[PDB]
Structures are given as C-alpha cells and as structure tokens.
Amino acid sequence: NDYCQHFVDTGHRPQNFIRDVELIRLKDELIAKSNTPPMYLQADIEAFDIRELTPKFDVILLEPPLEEYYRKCWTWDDIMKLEIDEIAAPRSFIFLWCGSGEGLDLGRVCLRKWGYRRCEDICWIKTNKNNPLDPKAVFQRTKEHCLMGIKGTVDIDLIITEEPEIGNIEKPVEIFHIIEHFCLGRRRLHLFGRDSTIRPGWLTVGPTLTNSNYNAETYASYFSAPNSYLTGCTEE
Amino acid sequence: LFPPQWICCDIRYLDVSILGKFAVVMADPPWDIGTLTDDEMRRLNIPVLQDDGFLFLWVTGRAMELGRECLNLWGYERVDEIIWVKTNQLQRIIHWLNHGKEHCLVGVKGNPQGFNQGLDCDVIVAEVRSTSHKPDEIYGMIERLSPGTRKIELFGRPHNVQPNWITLGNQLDGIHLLDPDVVARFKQRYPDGIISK
Numbered sequence A: 001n002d003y004c005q006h007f008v009d010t011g012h013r014p015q016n017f018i019r020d021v022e023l024i025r026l027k028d029e030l031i032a033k034s035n036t037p038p039m040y041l042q043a044d045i046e047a048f049d050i051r052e053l054t055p056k057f058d059v060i061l062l063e064p065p066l067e068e069y070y071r072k073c074w075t076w077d078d079i080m081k082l083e084i085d086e087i088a089a090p091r092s093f094i095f096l097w098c099g100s101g102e103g104l105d106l107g108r109v110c111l112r113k114w115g116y117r118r119c120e121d122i123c124w125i126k127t128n129k130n131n132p133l134d135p136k137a138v139f140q141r142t143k144e145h146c147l148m149g150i151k152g153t154v155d156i157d158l159i160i161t162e163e164p165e166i167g168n169i170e171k172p173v174e175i176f177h178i179i180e181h182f183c184l185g186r187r188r189l190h191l192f193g194r195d196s197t198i199r200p201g202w203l204t205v206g207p208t209l210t211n212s213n214y215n216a217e218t219y220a221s222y223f224s225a226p227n228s229y230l231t232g233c234t235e236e
Numbered sequence B: 001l002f003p004p005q006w007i008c009c010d011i012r013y014l015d016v017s018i019l020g021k022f023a024v025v026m027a028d029p030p031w032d033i034g035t036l037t038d039d040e041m042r043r044l045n046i047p048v049l050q051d052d053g054f055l056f057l058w059v060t061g062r063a064m065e066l067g068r069e070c071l072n073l074w075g076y077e078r079v080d081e082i083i084w085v086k087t088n089q090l091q092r093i094i095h096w097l098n099h100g101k102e103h104c105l106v107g108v109k110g111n112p113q114g115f116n117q118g119l120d121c122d123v124i125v126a127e128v129r130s131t132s133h134k135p136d137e138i139y140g141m142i143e144r145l146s147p148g149t150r151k152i153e154l155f156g157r158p159h160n161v162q163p164n165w166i167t168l169g170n171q172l173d174g175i176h177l178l179d180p181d182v183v184a185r186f187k188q189r190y191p192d193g194i195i196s197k
C-alpha cells in the first residue's frame, strides 16, 4: 500500500504504521555503574562565559530553544556564536538538535565552525496515532533532526515516538540511550537541559534550572587518575 | 507529451537546453562517496532546467553536505527534507549507527505559484527493493504537489519512467520522445542523433 496516499486520505502519518518500535542490558548496567553523580548548574548561557565549564568534554548535547518549537528563544545567529570549541576535548562528540527548518543547514555550519564533521544524522520521527506550517515548507513537517559531529580521531539512526502535546518541548530520552551506548567517555555536557532532563552521568547547564550543585574541582575529581580515560562502559 | 519519455545519454554531455523548463527536477546522482566527481556534479547544467519550481535531490553520506553545496550553487534554497524510512514486507525497519533511512533534500528556485504545498508529509514509509531503487511513492507526492506539469528526472533507470516525466540516464534503452517542442529542438541540436563530447 501507499502510505503517502493514505495520509492524504485519512491524516494518519506514514510512520504511524511502522511496526515493532539478549544481554545488551549488561552494557546498560556497566553504563549505570560508571556514571558520575548527576551534576547541574543554573546559568544564563547568553551571559555566561562557557570556559568556566571544565574539564573539556568528551560529549556535548546541545539543545538550544528554537522559536519553531513553540506554536527567550535562541536564533541560529545566537547559537553559531557559542564558543563550543573552547570546551570540547580534542577528540570529542557533539549532538546538536536542529529542528526541521533552516537549522538543518545552519546546524551543519555550526558543527564545521566548532571543528566537527557530521558523522550521523539522527531523525526523531513523530507519529500521530492519537490525533489523525512554515511559509517556505513544501510538506508537512513530522520530524526533527539531531546531528552528531565528531572532532579528532547497536543502535539505528531513527527515534520513533508519538508527537508530544503542544507546548511540550522535551526531546525523547532515547537520544541519551543512543549517546550512552557509544561509550565515548564520561565527561558529558548537556547545554540548555532542564530540571526534567537531569540524569546520572551528565552535567546539565541551562537557564531554567532551579537548583545547582556544580563545582569544577569536584567535577574534575570524578576523572582524576586512575579514571581519566574510561569509556563509560567499563568496570569501575 | 503526457506519456513517459526518456533519453539514454551521458548527463555530463547532453545539451539539456533543448528540453525546456520543468515544474520539478528530481535527481538520484552517483555521488563519489560509475560515479561523478564533485566538480562534475557541481558543473551539471541544472540552472537552465527551471525558472520557478522545486528540486528533489537524493543524498547519502557526505553527499548530505555536498548535495547542499550543489543545491545552493545551482541557485536553489533548501526548504524541506524528505526521509524515506526503509521497511520490509512486514513494515519493520531494515559506521557509528545503523542506517534506517535515506534523505531527499528539497530545494526551491524562484517563486513557484499554483503548487499544493502541505498535502503530504516529509516522511515516506515504503519497502526496500533492488539496490539504489528509490520508492515509487515520491512520484505520487510530486504529482499531488504539482499536477499535470512537466517534470524531469536525472540519473533514472528504466523503471523510473513515468507519465508527465522525461527521464535521463545512461541505462535507458534508446531515445523515446513525444513532445513536439522537444523532438523539434532535439532534431535541430542533434540532426544525426549522437550525444558525444
């Protein structure tokens, strides 16, 4: 059958009809034991010299609040001016939420500006099983992109969930599972996270956080020798 | 005009200006990731094919970036991005991550009028077939977007030929042209056939 046609007929997005979405849990349990305690800092990132966030990170998850999520917001002008290369480790990874509009282009510019090359394009595909427009848009937009960048030298590149309630800007927690299953290192930064996103193994920084516990000397102590080079998937 | 038409050619060397203007261009190029170098891709004479319309550009790997480059070089702005979720017959999905999709950049040129923007959504769910064979659903999406207008496909194979479409590719069988304005300009430009150099 033609699900494109079906969507025109009924309003059920084609992804509504995708189906089905052995000790790969021991990997998850190693992640859990290696995880640092959750750390978090309230900071207005427009006004905040990010160089105060130390040491340099192995993974950066960047989730700037785009205007299009809502139907202060950061524009791609603002985002491109973040000095992400000043806190990234020489070999490190970025996951940048780009939305579905011009961000798919301007996010690639950001990645190259900060010194990465895009190695994956992860799409969050939103179903509307429970509920059967940009002026430049040619099609109804039913997904978002999270770009993965790499600098220096099990999962699939799709997340499928139901479209969240209007006004809900959360991204699927599956993005964390994908990032953590890569075993990229233990210094993990989430910029523009919220109270709702704080998580073991992660440093969360955002303007809406209600509480802070970040201390740079304490944070670094989690990675002092003999723990400087752990993958995040090893025994403690 | 209406029925399928095609030209076996080397797209690098055909004088595409005999074909006229098209509401839609679609291409599935042999990116260098029988391929074309990045300069040959950049040099392709896409700009003459359209005045106001849309371009559909299949990309994988580093062509996700290079295709954006060609897109802009040829004079398009990328305004959408179709994702084809690849499934089997049971509607289940088929370096760092395994790939469940392929991307089709959508560019706009000029100011198109009379198109039905917003009828379809930017996700396709369709079975995998032979390799490099894109799903037929795209022709339905494109027809509903721009019904009855002239369309051109670059790097198509015999199964890609469709009504309202002119298909170009080097694995087509011969030259099948029906539009009088096209056969006219083809005879003038190519009085003996032959599309070399």
Ligand SMILES: Nc1ncnc2c1ncn2C[C@H]1OC[C@@H](N)[C@@H](O)[C@H]1O
Pocket (backbone or CB within 6 Å): B009, B010, B011, B012, B028, B029, B030, B034, B035, B036, B132, B154, B155, B156, B157, B168, B169, B170, B171
């Ligand atoms: N210089 C050229 N001129 C015309 N067609 C050409 C070409 N190089 C390759 N192709 C055809 C290829 O298109 C890409 C892909 N869909 C394959 O299936 C194959 O057909």
